[PDB]
Amino acid sequence: MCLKLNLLDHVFANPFMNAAGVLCSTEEDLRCMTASSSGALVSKSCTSAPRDGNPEPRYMAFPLGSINSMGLPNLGFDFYLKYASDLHDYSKKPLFLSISGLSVEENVAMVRRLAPVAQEKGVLLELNLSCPNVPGKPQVAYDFEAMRTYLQQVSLAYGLPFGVKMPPYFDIAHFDTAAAVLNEFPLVKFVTCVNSVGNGLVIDAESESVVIKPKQGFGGLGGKYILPTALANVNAFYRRCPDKLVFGCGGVYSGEDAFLHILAGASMVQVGTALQEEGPGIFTRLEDELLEIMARKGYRTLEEFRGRVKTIE
Amino acid sequence: MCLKLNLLDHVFANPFMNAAGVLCSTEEDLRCMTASSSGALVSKSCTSAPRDGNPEPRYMAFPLGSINSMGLPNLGFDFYLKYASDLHDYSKKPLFLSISGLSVEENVAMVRRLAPVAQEKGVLLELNLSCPNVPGKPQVAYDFEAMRTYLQQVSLAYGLPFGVKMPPYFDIAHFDTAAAVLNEFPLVKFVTCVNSVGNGLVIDAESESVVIKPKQGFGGLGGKYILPTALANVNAFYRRCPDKLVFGCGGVYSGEDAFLHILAGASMVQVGTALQEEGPGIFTRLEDELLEIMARKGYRTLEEFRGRVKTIE
Ligand SMILES: Cc1cc2nc3c(=O)[nH]c(=O)nc-3n(C[C@H](O)[C@H](O)[C@H](O)COP(=O)(O)O)c2cc1C
Numbered sequence: 001m002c003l004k005l006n007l008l009d010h011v012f013a014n015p016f017m018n019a020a021g022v023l024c025s026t027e028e029d030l031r032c033m034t035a036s037s038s039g040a041l042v043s044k045s046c047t048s049a050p051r052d053g054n055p056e057p058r059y060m061a062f063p064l065g066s067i068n069s070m071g072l073p074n075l076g077f078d079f080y081l082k083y084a085s086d087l088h089d090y091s092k093k094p095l096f097l098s099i100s101g102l103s104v105e106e107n108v109a110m111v112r113r114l115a116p117v118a119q120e121k122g123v124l125l126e127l128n129l130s131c132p133n134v135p136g137k138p139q140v141a142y143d144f145e146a147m148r149t150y151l152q153q154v155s156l157a158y159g160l161p162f163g164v165k166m167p168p169y170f171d172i173a174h175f176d177t178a179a180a181v182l183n184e185f186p187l188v189k190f191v192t193c194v195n196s197v198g199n200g201l202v203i204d205a206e207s208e209s210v211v212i213k214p215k216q217g218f219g220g221l222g223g224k225y226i227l228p229t230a231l232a233n234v235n236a237f238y239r240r241c242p243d244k245l246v247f248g249c250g251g252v253y254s255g256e257d258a259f260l261h262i263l264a265g266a267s268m269v270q271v272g273t274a275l276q277e278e279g280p281g282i283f284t285r286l287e288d289e290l291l292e293i294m295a296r297k298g299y300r301t302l303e304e305f306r307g308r309v310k311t312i313e
Numbered sequence: 314m315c316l317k318l319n320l321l322d323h324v325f326a327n328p329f330m331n332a333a334g335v336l337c338s339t340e341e342d343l344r345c346m347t348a349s350s351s352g353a354l355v356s357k358s359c360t361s362a363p364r365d366g367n368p369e370p371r372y373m374a375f376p377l378g379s380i381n382s383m384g385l386p387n388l389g390f391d392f393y394l395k396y397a398s399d400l401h402d403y404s405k406k407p408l409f410l411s412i413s414g415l416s417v418e419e420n421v422a423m424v425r426r427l428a429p430v431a432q433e434k435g436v437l438l439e440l441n442l443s444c445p446n447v448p449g450k451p452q453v454a455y456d457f458e459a460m461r462t463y464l465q466q467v468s469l470a471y472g473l474p475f476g477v478k479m480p481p482y483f484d485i486a487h488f489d490t491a492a493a494v495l496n497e498f499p500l501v502k503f504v505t506c507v508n509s510v511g512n513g514l515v516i517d518a519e520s521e522s523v524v525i526k527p528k529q530g531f532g533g534l535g536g537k538y539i540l541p542t543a544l545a546n547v548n549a550f551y552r553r554c555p556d557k558l559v560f561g562c563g564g565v566y567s568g569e570d571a572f573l574h575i576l577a578g579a580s581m582v583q584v585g586t587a588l589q590e591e592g593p594g595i596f597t598r599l600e601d602e603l604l605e606i607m608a609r610k611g612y613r614t615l616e617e618f619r620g621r622v623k624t625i626e
């Protein structure tokens with residue numbers, strides 16, 4: 001029938017949205033996402049100041065997915081805040097604003113300014129924890145002490161419900177440690193699993209060359225390559241964080257793929273590479289495909305199967 | 314034109330071999346790999362005592378790859394050592410023996426008894442550092458202090474050149490740290506990148522179920538899913554460990570995929586999921602396909618292009 005649902009004190013037409021960084025950087029992008037059939041949108045992760053990002057080519061796509069080292073090109077936080085405060089039409093769908101400062105201090109400074117706009121308009125914060133860390137350390141979400149510091153500071157500075165965007169993890173002990181960190185913060189109301197699978201390398205056989213210019217061709221992977229990774233992370237955090245929502249992201253190209261994310265535990269389903277490749281018309285297709293699978297199975301709601309993946313024995 | 318390699322004081326007809334765990338567990342398996350056109354073979358990672366492994370189903374394969382949680386089923390060290398010392402025909406090809414003890418002591422005891430056979434017969438050791446350590450801690454190669462303890466102890470106990478099988482990493486700081494640990498050990502003469510991308514989750518949309526029984530369906534991923542991750546790891550370690558060889562493993566289904574691994578830096582090229590799916594016939598196909606790309610490009614030997622991947626500016 002219809003896929004509408006209520007989460008975080010907002011109403012959504014359906015569980016689909018863009019993934020941060022795809023079709024969300026400019027006013028044009030945001031208006032295009034708002035005009036789409038997606039149930040929500042998220043803005044490009046921002047810094048306090050604008051960034052040009054890395055040299056091109058910095059994104060490439062292939063049959064099985066994509067690689068990128070964008071370098072966080074963005075119009076700066078003042079723009080995104082302005083978009084949230086003055087330009088977005090909340091009657092069309094909810095808005096998420098993603099932030100990724102280069103230090104804890106920059107994040108705190110941005111969230112102190114966002115808080116009043118979140119109160120006033122209901123924009124929702126997604127904090128991207130695959131942001132840069134101090135020398136010699138990995139990205140913040142791969143440092144669990146840094147991760148706890150960031151969340152402590154943002155929670156105190158912001159004081160309102162927010163979410164976090166996570167990189168994938170590959171080790172059960174890491175799932176346990178990461179979820180335990182997140183569960184220290186009651187203000188963290190959603191966990192988005194996953195960001196790109198870090199530092200892959202795509203090589204063209206014909207040219208004998210890497211396909212993106214930054215970082216000697218290394219970049220984050222998205223798309224078909226990453227769906228079982230994504231699913232694992234969604235389910236691991238769904239299991240571990242019962243008092244939070246999980247949003248799935250990674251490898252969604254069809255309503256069947258969305259269905260699997262929801263079975264794993266996803267509340268909202270985010271679309272990155274397939275959206276970058278197909279454009280915003282993908283949202284109508286995904287909705288139709290998800291409703292078709294539901295109808296064939298006899299499910300009339302998302303809640304009937306969310307998190308209900310079956311295990312053997 | 315030729316695929317021949319001379320490394321580690323052995324001669325190899327071509328760079329292809331099985332990946333540890335595939336077509337390697339029984340005497341029958343080992344004789345099969347020996348009879349194949351591969352350039353070498355490796356035996357199933359073993360423990361001192363035989364193991365039955367995890368309950369079935371514990372491996373599944375799909376168009377894009379495989380997932381497994383086998384649980385290290387194996388015939389025990391004494392079996393593999395006997396194979397190496399009494400059964401293997403070294404006139405056909407070289408043999409690698411993989412070990413994966415559950416503690417540093419278990420690994421030390423195996424390699425002490427392997428040493429004289431290594432010296433006399435020329436079997437080559439591959440130490441699997443995805444062995445679990447203490448449960449609740451990450452696998453050994455994701456615990457850099459543990460990794461260093463294992464390598465110090467095995468190096469002292471074995472006293473001969475050996476190699477290590479590494480899991481993939483996803484963060485530049487981890488590439489840097491891992492390679493620096495490895496470079497502390499002059500006896501580590503080769504690094505095989507990569508083991509399975511850990512703890513993925515495949516879900517079957519029709520049955521709404523995971524597809525393997527252990528670990529609530531979580532298992533390591535191989536195959537097409539993981540080629541760009543594999544390449545990245547090969548190249549990262551090739552750049553960071555100039556005094557060691559790198560062997561590539563992950564995502565090889567064709568001579569083109571092998572060509573990419575070799576461009577990245579691979580010496581030997583191991584084949585896991587594709588071999589498990591196609592059987593040992595795959596080796597003649599891979600050899601033909603790789604020779605065809607070399608002929609098109611005018612390459613006569615593998616050294617012409619090994620590690621010669623181009624970057625952009
Ligand atoms: C071009 C591009 C830019 C992205 N930039 C961001 C970003 O600014 N913030 C973020 O949280 N993730 C970013 N991502 C990651 C995606 O949001 C998503 O987590 C990843 O692409 C996996 O989803 P997919 O398989 O649907 O592509 C970016 C991805 C791409 C492809």
Ligand SMILES: Cc1cc2nc3c(=O)[nH]c(=O)nc-3n(C[C@H](O)[C@H](O)[C@H](O)COP(=O)(O)O)c2cc1C
Pocket residue numbers: 332333334335357358372379381383385411441478507508509534535536537539562563564565583584585586587589
């Ligand atoms: C059924 C199965 C068993 C495995 N057993 C082992 C093992 O005993 N030792 C090990 O080093 N790697 C093991 N692996 C990992 C493979 O050696 C290889 O690293 C991984 O499958 C990636 O290569 P692929 O993409 O060609 O499958 C196993 C993989 C499979 C599929």
Ligand SMILES: COc1ccc2cccc(CCc3c(C(=O)O)[nH]c(=O)[nH]c3=O)c2c1
Pocket residue numbers: 021045068069070071072073100101102128130131132195196220
């Ligand atoms: C790769 O170069 C940088 C440089 C600065 C960054 C600052 C904050 C966040 C990020 C991560 C932004 C991001 C990017 C990106 O813009 O390269 N791509 C992703 O697939 N996920 C992401 O989360 C930064 C990345």
Ligand SMILES: COc1ccc2cccc(CCc3c(C(=O)O)[nH]c(=O)[nH]c3=O)c2c1
Pocket residue numbers: 334358381382383384385386413414415441443444445508509533
């Ligand atoms: C999944 O459960 C166990 C249990 C005991 C193990 C002991 C040493 C190494 C390993 C890892 C063996 C392994 C396995 C495995 O046998 O599950 N599969 C892989 O893809 N790569 C590997 O390296 C063990 C794994």
